[PDB]
Amino acid sequence: IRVFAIPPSFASIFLTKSTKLTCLVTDLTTYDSVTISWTRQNGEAVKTHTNISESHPNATFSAVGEASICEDDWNSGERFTCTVTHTDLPSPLKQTISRPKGVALHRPDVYLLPPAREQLNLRESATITCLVTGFSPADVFVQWMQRGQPLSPEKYVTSAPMPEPQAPGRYFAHSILTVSEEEWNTGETYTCVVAHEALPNRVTERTVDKSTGKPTLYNVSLVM
Amino acid sequence: IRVFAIPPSFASIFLTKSTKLTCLVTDLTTYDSVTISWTRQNGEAVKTHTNISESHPNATFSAVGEASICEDDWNSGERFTCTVTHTDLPSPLKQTISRPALHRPDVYLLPPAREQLNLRESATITCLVTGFSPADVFVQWMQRGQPLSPEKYVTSAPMPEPQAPGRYFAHSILTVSEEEWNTGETYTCVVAHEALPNRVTERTVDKSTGKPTLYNVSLVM
Amino acid sequence: IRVFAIPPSFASIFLTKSTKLTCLVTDLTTYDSVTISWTRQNGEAVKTHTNISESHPNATFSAVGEASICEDDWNSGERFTCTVTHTDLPSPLKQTISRPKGVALHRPDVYLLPPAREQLNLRESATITCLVTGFSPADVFVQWMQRGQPLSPEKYVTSAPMPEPQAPGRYFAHSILTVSEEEWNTGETYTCVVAHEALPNRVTERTVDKSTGKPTLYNVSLVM
Amino acid sequence: EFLIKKCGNNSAHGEEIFSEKLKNAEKKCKSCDLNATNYIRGCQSKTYDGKIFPGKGGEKQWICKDTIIHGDTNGACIPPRTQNLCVGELWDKSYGGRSNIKNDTKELLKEKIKNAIHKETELLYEYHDTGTAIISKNDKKGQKGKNDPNGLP
C-alpha cells in the first residue's frame, strides 16, 4: 500500500558521491515475485537492483529498489519514476520524483561560540556551539574535525533547519559538541566544518581555541 | 601516427564534476572518414565525439575523441579503450587507460620576509604543501572570500621528498603589494587532494598573527 | 644512430674551475674503434676521449666522447664541432655547440624563511626555505652551509627554475632544507649560499637562526 | 624484603627452607632479509651526550634521587640516555602530550613495539658509529682505536 521514491539527500551525496534513488514499498501483505523497476522521464533502463528485504516480522511485504545514478543525471532534471507490478495490482503503479529546481540561493554564515565563563568555573565539561544562519535552501551538512582527524557522530549533535522568522526564506541551525574541561586547556583547535551548495567550493570551516577571545591586559609604553 | 588518451586530472574533475575521456589522433596527414569509438573494459561503446577538428593549417588531421562518463567507473579502476579506424590502417588501433598509497597532505603558510618589506616595492606569500601521496594536488587562492585571477599566483610541480620515498611536496607563491599587506588582507590559500577527508582544506595568515596578543608594548623617542 | 652533444653546466664548471664538453654516440651498430675528434668552429682539433664503455643492454656499443678546453673560448660562443667516423655511418656525423649569446642579465636576490611557528608544535621536524628570485638567465646553483661545514648533498632539495608571472624574462627558484626540531632551539645559523652567473662575485651568502626577528632592545617576559 | 627473600615465609610459618637446602645440593650432582621495515616518526637522532658534529652542546644531566615530582623511584639517578629514550609513536608529543594507544589489539601493539626496537637499534648504531658517545669516544686518533674484534663501535 505504502509506496515512496525518496530523492537523494545532499549529505549522502557529499559523504558517498554515490547518488541513489530509493524506492520503498511497504505496508502491504507479504507476497512473492513482486516486480520493482526504475525509469527516467522517458523510461530508460536502470541497474538490476537486488538485495530486496524479506517479509516484515508482522507479515508485511517489503520491497526495496535502488537506482544507481551519478550527480549529472540527477541535476539534469530528468524526473525519474519507480514502477511496481504484482498480481494483486489492478495496474502497475508508477510514482514520479524529481528535484524541485527554482529556489533562491544564499551563502550561509557561520560562527563558533566559546563556552560560558561560568561554565568554565565548575570545570567539569565544556560545550562548543557552531552556529550557521542565513542560507537558502535548506539541507546543509555539518561535522567536526579534531586536530586533523575526524570524530564519530556520537559526540556531537546537530539541529534541524527551521525557518528564520525575520528573513523571508532563510534558515539557521546549531551544532553542539561536549568535551572535558581539561582538554580545553591544551590547544585542541576543534575545527567545525560545514558544507552547502551555495559556497564557491561547497566546503567551509572555522577554528577556535582556549586563547581566542581573551583581550590584551597591558598597554605598557616606554619613552626614553 | 600518434594516438594517445589523456586521463582526466584530479583538478579537472574537482573543478567541473564532469570527468571526461579524451583521446587524440594527431600528427598525421590530412584525410577524411576517420572514426573514434570509446569503449569500456568489456567493449561497451559510449557516446561518440562531436566538434571534430577539420584539416588543420599545419597539415595535421586531429580526429579528437571525447566521451562523457562520470566518476563511478573511473573510481572502480575499470579499463577504458578508444578504438581508431583510419583509411591508412587496415586494423583499428586500440589503447587502454585506467586509474592506478594514500597519505594526508599538510599545509603551511609563510609570510613575506622582513627584508622584503624594506625595499617597499613588493611582497611574496608562500602556501606550502608537503607529505602527501600520490601526486597531482590542486591549489588556488581566495581573498576575503573573493577569487583572484589565476595569473597572479604560481604553483610548482610535485617532487619526491628526500627522506620519505612515497611522500611528495609542492610550493605555491602569490605576489602582492606591501602597503595592502600592512593593513590586513587575509589571502587565504585553499588546497584540494584525494587523501583529504573532505577533499578540501584552507588556511590563512595576515600581518598580525605572531603577535603575543596578551600585552601591547610600544616605544617612542 | 644518435649523437648527444651536451653543453657544460654552470654548476659543474663552477665547482671544477674548468669546462668540459662531451658528445657521445649511441644507437649505432655494435662496433668499437669509432673515431671521435673534438675540433673548434674554425677547425682545430683537441685531445679525444678515453675509457670507452661497453655495449648497451639493447646490443648497441656505447662509445664515449669528451674534451676539455679553456672556458674563455666557451665565453666567445665558438660553435665547437665534434666529428664522429664509424663503419656503419657513410659520412662522419658533425654537431656544433656553443653558448646561447644574446640574453639579458639581472641580479638575483635571495631571501631565507624559517620554519612555520605552527610546525614547531609536533617536535618532529622543521624546514628552512632559501628562495632565489628576479634573475636571468636560468641555471643557478644552491648549496647549504652550517657553521662553515658542508652538508650532505641529499639533506636538501632545490626546485627547478620557471618563469616569473609578471616579468617575462625573470625567473625564480626554491630550495628547502629539512632538519630536526630540538637543535633549531639553538640555531646553528644554517647558512645558504647561491652561485649565479650574473652576480658580481658569483657567490652570495645568507643566514638565519631562531633569534633573528627579536627586537634586540628590550627583554619583556611573562610568568605566572 | 631482602630478609624475607632470604628466609621467613608467611611470618615463620615453618622451617621447610632447610628442605630447599637440599635443593642447592640437588643441582650440583654433576627470516628478516627484507627492507620493508619502513620508518617511524618521533625520533630523529640521539643527543643525550651532545649534538653530532658540527653541532655542539646539548648535554643531559642525571636526575636527583631525592625528588617529589620525579624520583619517586627510590633507586639511583636517571641516566641521560634513558631520558632520550625514543618511545616511538606509542606515545605522542602533542600540545600537552597524550597517548594514541586506546583501541588496538595485541598484534598491532607488538608490531609497533618491534618497530620501536628497530628504530632504537638503528639510531644507537649510527650514534656510536661517529664516536660522539662518551663510552664510544676514544682519544683523538681515528676515534676507532679501541674497536672490538667484531667490526663494531
PDB file of C-alpha atoms in Angstrom, chain C residues 3-142:
ATOM      1  CA  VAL C   3      74.732  11.632 -31.009  1.00  0.00           C
ATOM      2  CA  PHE C   4      74.071  13.836 -27.975  1.00  0.00           C
ATOM      3  CA  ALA C   5      76.317  16.895 -27.559  1.00  0.00           C
ATOM      4  CA  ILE C   6      75.692  18.092 -24.003  1.00  0.00           C
ATOM      5  CA  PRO C   7      76.993  21.602 -23.259  1.00  0.00           C
ATOM      6  CA  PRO C   8      78.753  22.080 -19.914  1.00  0.00           C
ATOM      7  CA  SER C   9      76.631  23.118 -16.952  1.00  0.00           C
ATOM      8  CA  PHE C  10      77.215  26.256 -14.903  1.00  0.00           C
ATOM      9  CA  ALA C  11      77.465  24.365 -11.606  1.00  0.00           C
ATOM     10  CA  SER C  12      79.922  21.782 -12.951  1.00  0.00           C
ATOM     11  CA  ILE C  13      82.283  24.364 -14.445  1.00  0.00           C
ATOM     12  CA  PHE C  14      81.950  26.472 -11.291  1.00  0.00           C
ATOM     13  CA  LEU C  15      82.922  23.660  -8.924  1.00  0.00           C
ATOM     14  CA  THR C  16      85.590  22.112 -11.179  1.00  0.00           C
ATOM     15  CA  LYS C  17      87.059  25.529 -12.139  1.00  0.00           C
ATOM     16  CA  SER C  18      87.221  24.140 -15.691  1.00  0.00           C
ATOM     17  CA  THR C  19      84.909  23.403 -18.610  1.00  0.00           C
ATOM     18  CA  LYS C  20      84.327  20.057 -20.323  1.00  0.00           C
ATOM     19  CA  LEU C  21      82.292  19.440 -23.479  1.00  0.00           C
ATOM     20  CA  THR C  22      81.041  15.939 -24.283  1.00  0.00           C
ATOM     21  CA  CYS C  23      79.240  14.456 -27.282  1.00  0.00           C
ATOM     22  CA  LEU C  24      78.503  10.725 -27.285  1.00  0.00           C
ATOM     23  CA  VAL C  25      77.161   8.389 -29.979  1.00  0.00           C
ATOM     24  CA  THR C  26      74.544   5.722 -29.228  1.00  0.00           C
ATOM     25  CA  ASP C  27      72.033   3.566 -31.131  1.00  0.00           C
ATOM     26  CA  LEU C  28      74.666   2.808 -33.784  1.00  0.00           C
ATOM     27  CA  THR C  29      75.948  -0.618 -34.788  1.00  0.00           C
ATOM     28  CA  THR C  30      77.780  -2.578 -32.091  1.00  0.00           C
ATOM     29  CA  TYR C  31      81.422  -1.962 -33.005  1.00  0.00           C
ATOM     30  CA  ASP C  32      84.378  -0.297 -31.294  1.00  0.00           C
ATOM     31  CA  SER C  33      87.159   1.848 -32.822  1.00  0.00           C
ATOM     32  CA  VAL C  34      84.949   4.874 -33.516  1.00  0.00           C
ATOM     33  CA  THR C  35      86.985   7.964 -34.416  1.00  0.00           C
ATOM     34  CA  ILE C  36      85.682  10.949 -32.426  1.00  0.00           C
ATOM     35  CA  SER C  37      87.501  14.262 -32.907  1.00  0.00           C
ATOM     36  CA  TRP C  38      86.658  17.418 -30.944  1.00  0.00           C
ATOM     37  CA  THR C  39      87.534  20.365 -33.185  1.00  0.00           C
ATOM     38  CA  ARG C  40      86.745  24.059 -32.965  1.00  0.00           C
ATOM     39  CA  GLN C  41      84.415  26.037 -35.222  1.00  0.00           C
ATOM     40  CA  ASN C  42      87.465  27.165 -37.223  1.00  0.00           C
ATOM     41  CA  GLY C  43      88.706  23.566 -37.470  1.00  0.00           C
ATOM     42  CA  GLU C  44      91.254  22.980 -34.693  1.00  0.00           C
ATOM     43  CA  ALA C  45      91.063  19.555 -33.060  1.00  0.00           C
ATOM     44  CA  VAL C  46      91.949  18.749 -29.446  1.00  0.00           C
ATOM     45  CA  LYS C  47      92.620  15.633 -27.384  1.00  0.00           C
ATOM     46  CA  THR C  48      89.971  12.949 -27.867  1.00  0.00           C
ATOM     47  CA  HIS C  49      88.062  10.984 -25.219  1.00  0.00           C
ATOM     48  CA  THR C  50      89.104   7.938 -23.183  1.00  0.00           C
ATOM     49  CA  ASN C  51      87.622   4.922 -21.384  1.00  0.00           C
ATOM     50  CA  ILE C  52      85.037   3.871 -23.960  1.00  0.00           C
ATOM     51  CA  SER C  53      82.193   1.994 -22.286  1.00  0.00           C
ATOM     52  CA  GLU C  54      80.851  -1.435 -23.230  1.00  0.00           C
ATOM     53  CA  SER C  55      77.719  -2.290 -25.215  1.00  0.00           C
ATOM     54  CA  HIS C  56      74.268  -1.130 -24.161  1.00  0.00           C
ATOM     55  CA  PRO C  57      71.666  -3.643 -22.922  1.00  0.00           C
ATOM     56  CA  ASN C  58      69.963  -3.271 -26.334  1.00  0.00           C
ATOM     57  CA  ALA C  59      73.041  -4.757 -28.085  1.00  0.00           C
ATOM     58  CA  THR C  60      74.476  -1.359 -29.061  1.00  0.00           C
ATOM     59  CA  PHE C  61      78.108  -0.492 -28.388  1.00  0.00           C
ATOM     60  CA  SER C  62      78.306   2.702 -26.314  1.00  0.00           C
ATOM     61  CA  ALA C  63      81.149   4.997 -27.359  1.00  0.00           C
ATOM     62  CA  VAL C  64      82.069   7.912 -25.116  1.00  0.00           C
ATOM     63  CA  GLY C  65      83.227  11.303 -26.339  1.00  0.00           C
ATOM     64  CA  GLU C  66      84.597  14.225 -24.345  1.00  0.00           C
ATOM     65  CA  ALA C  67      87.117  17.051 -24.364  1.00  0.00           C
ATOM     66  CA  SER C  68      88.409  19.755 -22.030  1.00  0.00           C
ATOM     67  CA  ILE C  69      89.208  23.287 -23.205  1.00  0.00           C
ATOM     68  CA  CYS C  70      89.636  26.736 -21.691  1.00  0.00           C
ATOM     69  CA  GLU C  71      86.434  28.481 -20.626  1.00  0.00           C
ATOM     70  CA  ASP C  72      87.490  31.719 -22.347  1.00  0.00           C
ATOM     71  CA  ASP C  73      86.791  30.212 -25.773  1.00  0.00           C
ATOM     72  CA  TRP C  74      83.434  28.961 -24.485  1.00  0.00           C
ATOM     73  CA  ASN C  75      82.631  32.534 -23.444  1.00  0.00           C
ATOM     74  CA  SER C  76      83.363  33.588 -27.039  1.00  0.00           C
ATOM     75  CA  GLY C  77      80.435  31.499 -28.285  1.00  0.00           C
ATOM     76  CA  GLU C  78      82.567  29.391 -30.619  1.00  0.00           C
ATOM     77  CA  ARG C  79      80.481  26.612 -32.189  1.00  0.00           C
ATOM     78  CA  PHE C  80      82.841  23.786 -31.292  1.00  0.00           C
ATOM     79  CA  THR C  81      82.259  20.769 -33.527  1.00  0.00           C
ATOM     80  CA  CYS C  82      82.616  17.063 -32.813  1.00  0.00           C
ATOM     81  CA  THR C  83      83.149  14.768 -35.802  1.00  0.00           C
ATOM     82  CA  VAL C  84      82.355  11.055 -35.495  1.00  0.00           C
ATOM     83  CA  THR C  85      83.558   8.487 -38.041  1.00  0.00           C
ATOM     84  CA  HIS C  86      82.339   4.887 -37.884  1.00  0.00           C
ATOM     85  CA  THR C  87      81.983   1.916 -40.212  1.00  0.00           C
ATOM     86  CA  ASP C  88      78.173   1.948 -40.266  1.00  0.00           C
ATOM     87  CA  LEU C  89      77.868   5.669 -40.987  1.00  0.00           C
ATOM     88  CA  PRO C  90      78.697   6.556 -44.619  1.00  0.00           C
ATOM     89  CA  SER C  91      79.738  10.122 -43.787  1.00  0.00           C
ATOM     90  CA  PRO C  92      81.014  11.484 -40.462  1.00  0.00           C
ATOM     91  CA  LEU C  93      78.436  12.962 -38.109  1.00  0.00           C
ATOM     92  CA  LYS C  94      79.108  16.569 -37.115  1.00  0.00           C
ATOM     93  CA  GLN C  95      77.381  18.694 -34.482  1.00  0.00           C
ATOM     94  CA  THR C  96      78.308  22.175 -33.254  1.00  0.00           C
ATOM     95  CA  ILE C  97      77.671  23.503 -29.742  1.00  0.00           C
ATOM     96  CA  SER C  98      78.157  26.979 -28.282  1.00  0.00           C
ATOM     97  CA  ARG C  99      76.850  29.187 -25.506  1.00  0.00           C
ATOM     98  CA  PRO C 100      73.496  30.935 -26.198  1.00  0.00           C
ATOM     99  CA  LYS C 101      74.678  34.522 -26.538  1.00  0.00           C
ATOM    100  CA  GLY C 102      72.114  37.311 -26.545  1.00  0.00           C
ATOM    101  CA  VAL C 103      70.446  37.002 -23.137  1.00  0.00           C
ATOM    102  CA  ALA C 104      69.723  39.766 -20.644  1.00  0.00           C
ATOM    103  CA  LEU C 105      71.408  39.646 -17.238  1.00  0.00           C
ATOM    104  CA  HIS C 106      69.774  40.577 -13.938  1.00  0.00           C
ATOM    105  CA  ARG C 107      70.986  40.228 -10.370  1.00  0.00           C
ATOM    106  CA  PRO C 108      69.079  37.594  -8.367  1.00  0.00           C
ATOM    107  CA  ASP C 109      68.008  38.404  -4.841  1.00  0.00           C
ATOM    108  CA  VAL C 110      67.940  35.825  -2.066  1.00  0.00           C
ATOM    109  CA  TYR C 111      65.700  35.549   0.987  1.00  0.00           C
ATOM    110  CA  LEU C 112      65.581  32.992   3.783  1.00  0.00           C
ATOM    111  CA  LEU C 113      62.381  31.907   5.531  1.00  0.00           C
ATOM    112  CA  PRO C 114      62.446  29.987   8.822  1.00  0.00           C
ATOM    113  CA  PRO C 115      60.056  27.109   9.561  1.00  0.00           C
ATOM    114  CA  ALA C 116      56.455  27.998  10.312  1.00  0.00           C
ATOM    115  CA  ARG C 117      55.861  28.641  14.005  1.00  0.00           C
ATOM    116  CA  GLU C 118      52.892  26.261  13.949  1.00  0.00           C
ATOM    117  CA  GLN C 119      55.092  23.444  12.616  1.00  0.00           C
ATOM    118  CA  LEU C 120      57.233  23.775  15.746  1.00  0.00           C
ATOM    119  CA  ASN C 121      54.435  22.190  17.778  1.00  0.00           C
ATOM    120  CA  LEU C 122      54.915  18.493  16.950  1.00  0.00           C
ATOM    121  CA  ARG C 123      58.628  18.438  17.890  1.00  0.00           C
ATOM    122  CA  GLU C 124      59.216  16.179  14.883  1.00  0.00           C
ATOM    123  CA  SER C 125      60.946  18.148  12.109  1.00  0.00           C
ATOM    124  CA  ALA C 126      61.267  21.575  10.510  1.00  0.00           C
ATOM    125  CA  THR C 127      62.042  23.036   7.094  1.00  0.00           C
ATOM    126  CA  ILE C 128      64.024  26.156   6.173  1.00  0.00           C
ATOM    127  CA  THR C 129      63.437  27.680   2.739  1.00  0.00           C
ATOM    128  CA  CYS C 130      66.136  29.520   0.785  1.00  0.00           C
ATOM    129  CA  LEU C 131      64.354  31.412  -2.008  1.00  0.00           C
ATOM    130  CA  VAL C 132      66.001  32.999  -5.052  1.00  0.00           C
ATOM    131  CA  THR C 133      64.128  35.264  -7.439  1.00  0.00           C
ATOM    132  CA  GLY C 134      64.455  38.014 -10.017  1.00  0.00           C
ATOM    133  CA  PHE C 135      67.221  36.805 -12.313  1.00  0.00           C
ATOM    134  CA  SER C 136      68.076  35.900 -15.897  1.00  0.00           C
ATOM    135  CA  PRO C 137      69.136  33.585 -17.346  1.00  0.00           C
ATOM    136  CA  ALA C 138      68.442  30.212 -15.711  1.00  0.00           C
ATOM    137  CA  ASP C 139      70.859  27.602 -14.303  1.00  0.00           C
ATOM    138  CA  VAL C 140      71.511  28.886 -10.786  1.00  0.00           C
ATOM    139  CA  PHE C 141      73.329  26.796  -8.173  1.00  0.00           C
ATOM    140  CA  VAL C 142      72.398  26.489  -4.494  1.00  0.00           C
TER     141      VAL C 142
END
